[PDB]
Amino acid sequence: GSVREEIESLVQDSLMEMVKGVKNTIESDLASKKGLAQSTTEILQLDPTNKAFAKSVLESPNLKGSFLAIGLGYESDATVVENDDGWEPNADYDPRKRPWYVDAKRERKLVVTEPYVDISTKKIIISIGTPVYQQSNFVGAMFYDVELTQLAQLVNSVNLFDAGYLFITTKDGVTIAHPNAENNGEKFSQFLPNVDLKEGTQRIELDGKYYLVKFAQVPSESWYIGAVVDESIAFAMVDDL
Amino acid sequence: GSVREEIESLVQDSLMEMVKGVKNTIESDLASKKGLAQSTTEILQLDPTNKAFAKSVLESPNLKGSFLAIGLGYESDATVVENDDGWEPNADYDPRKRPWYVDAKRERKLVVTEPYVDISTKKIIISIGTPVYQQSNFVGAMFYDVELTQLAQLVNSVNLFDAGYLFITTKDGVTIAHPNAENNGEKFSQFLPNVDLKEGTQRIELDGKYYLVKFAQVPSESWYIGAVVDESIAFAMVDDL
Numbered sequence: 491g492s493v494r495e496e497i498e499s500l501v502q503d504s505l506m507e508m509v510k511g512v513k514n515t516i517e518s519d520l521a522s523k524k525g526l527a528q529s530t531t532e533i534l535q536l537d538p539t540n541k542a543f544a545k546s547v548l549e550s551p552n553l554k555g556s557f558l559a560i561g562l563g564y565e566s567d568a569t570v571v572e573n574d575d576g577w578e579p580n581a582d583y584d585p586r587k588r589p590w591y592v593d594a595k596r597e598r599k600l601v602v603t604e605p606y607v608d609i610s611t612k613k614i615i616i617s618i619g620t621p622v623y624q625q626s627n628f629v630g631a632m633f634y635d636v637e638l639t640q641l642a643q644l645v646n647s648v649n650l651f652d653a654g655y656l657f658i659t660t661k662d663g664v665t666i667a668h669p670n671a672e673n674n675g676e677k678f679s680q681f682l683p684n685v686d687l688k689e690g691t692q693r694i695e696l697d698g699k700y701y702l703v704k705f706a707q708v709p710s711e712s713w714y715i716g717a718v719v720d721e722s723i724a725f726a727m728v729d730d731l
Numbered sequence: 732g733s734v735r736e737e738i739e740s741l742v743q744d745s746l747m748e749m750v751k752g753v754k755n756t757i758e759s760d761l762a763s764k765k766g767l768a769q770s771t772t773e774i775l776q777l778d779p780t781n782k783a784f785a786k787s788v789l790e791s792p793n794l795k796g797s798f799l800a801i802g803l804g805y806e807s808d809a810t811v812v813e814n815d816d817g818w819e820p821n822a823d824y825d826p827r828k829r830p831w832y833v834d835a836k837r838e839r840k841l842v843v844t845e846p847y848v849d850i851s852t853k854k855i856i857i858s859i860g861t862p863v864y865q866q867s868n869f870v871g872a873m874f875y876d877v878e879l880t881q882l883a884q885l886v887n888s889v890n891l892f893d894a895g896y897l898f899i900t901t902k903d904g905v906t907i908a909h910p911n912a913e914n915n916g917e918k919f920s921q922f923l924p925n926v927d928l929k930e931g932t933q934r935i936e937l938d939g940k941y942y943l944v945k946f947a948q949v950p951s952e953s954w955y956i957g958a959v960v961d962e963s964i965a966f967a968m969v970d971d972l
């Protein structure tokens with residue numbers, strides 16, 4: 491179809507635009523925050539076990555203001571130095587079982603985690619994680635919490651034909667941004683069944699309607715951006731003009 | 732008329748692309764470094780007079796790889812702690828008389844200097860400046876040197892349909908990037924007389940020839956981007972098609 495090849499072309503335009511939106515906001519924020527976390531981690535290995543030192547550094551204003559929260563968890567006694575004014579570890583918190591820590595211990599360098607549920611705010615976030623060494627003795631790890639607010643803002647700022655929207659998922663298809671926020675945390679197949687997670691153009695039927703869907707990857711985070719429109723409506727709009 | 736207006740239109744399209752490019756490379760990167768330089772400074776205020784701590788921080792890898800060079804010069808003393816492996820202050824060097832020191836002590840907060848000639852590398856650079864405070868008094872200022880290589884990258888990557896080119900100057904009219912590097916350091920009026928440093932379209936005559944020039948500002952640096960073409964060449968190229 492020629493009107494249909496135009497629908498697809500337009501969906502592609504918005505999708506590419508949304509991919510550039512993500513890279514220019516979140517992705518460049520992370521790259522900047524990564525430099526901050528890496529250097530903070532290096533400065534702390536000047537004297538890693540000095541908790542007094544560690545706390546002073548994490549409470550310095552700009553650093554404290556660039557992240558949701560920052561902390562250091564120690565391998566020896568599972569304690570936590572952190573800068574979150576309103577949160578304290580409850581007796582059951584073990585830094586070493588948290589994903590920022592596991593990843594950092596495994597990869598042995600700066601790491602960005604997959605999205606996960608924050609214990610402090612119960613929001614879905616990501617963290618920068620770093621290993622801490624004392625002469626190549628691994629003595630603990632750090633988290634630098636980044637919130638995902640900007641994705642929610644991008645995903646609510648765009649309309650497709652008033653008959654479609656964009657959404658964002660992880661590499662395993664867990665939704666992390668969606669105009670209807672109930673769907674976050676869900677695999678996308680819960681609201682968009684019979685769709686594969688892959689680049690390309692897919693066409694489906696759902697509850698008596700016909701939808702066009704296209705995905706694109708954001709390789710650095712391994713996220714997917716989905717665009718989905720009602721194809722009957724979009725056809726009506728393009729033929730009418 | 733029509734062909735002249737199109738020339739103006741094309742030159743404008745390239746000027747705007749160059750503005751967007753400048754904000755998306757060096758400006759973003761600057762924002763990033765400002766964050767880094769601000770946290771490095773606040774952490775050094777944990778122990779401003781401790782010279783050995785200052786040195787082990789500035790020699791930390793990620794930080795020392797983020798800037799051309801970094802240093803700290805003391806008010807009372809004019810002594811300098813720095814991480815340049817290719818420079819050491821001679822008997823004449825007084826940090827307190829350098830532009831980065833001066834601006835920082837003036838503004839009492841983080842600053843970005845105007846383009847100036849680096850005492851070490853002799854190239855034209857900018858520095859971030861930050862004041863250093865201990866228990867509410869000035870004990871010195873810091874520098875974070877940033878190269879301007881990206882500007883050269885930008886102006887050497889485009890060529891206004893082989894009839895002219897783009898160039899960049901400070902707010903005072905000093906060329907900091909030009910496809911022909913020997914103009915750098917000179918006022919732009921030396922190669923392009925009778926052109927005012929203001930936004931808008933100008934037409935001049937110079938040594939028999941006719942030139943079109945558009946300037947645009949990048950407000951947060953107060954730099955000007957200039958786009959110039961030989962208007963007779965541009966005419967031959969556009970009327971053809």
Ligand SMILES: NC(=O)C[C@H](N)C(=O)O
Nearest residue numbers: 559588608609610633635
């Ligand atoms: N403050 C924290 O909760 C640290 C980290 N975000 C975690 O959930 O384990």
Ligand SMILES: NC(=O)C[C@H](N)C(=O)O
Nearest residue numbers: 829848849850851874876
């Ligand atoms: N000391 C330095 O090299 C910093 C700066 N380039 C200056 O000329 O003062």
Ligand SMILES: [Ca+2]
Nearest residue numbers: 574575577578
């Ligand atoms: Ca706390």
Ligand SMILES: [Ca+2]
Nearest residue numbers: 815816818819
């Ligand atoms: Ca030196």
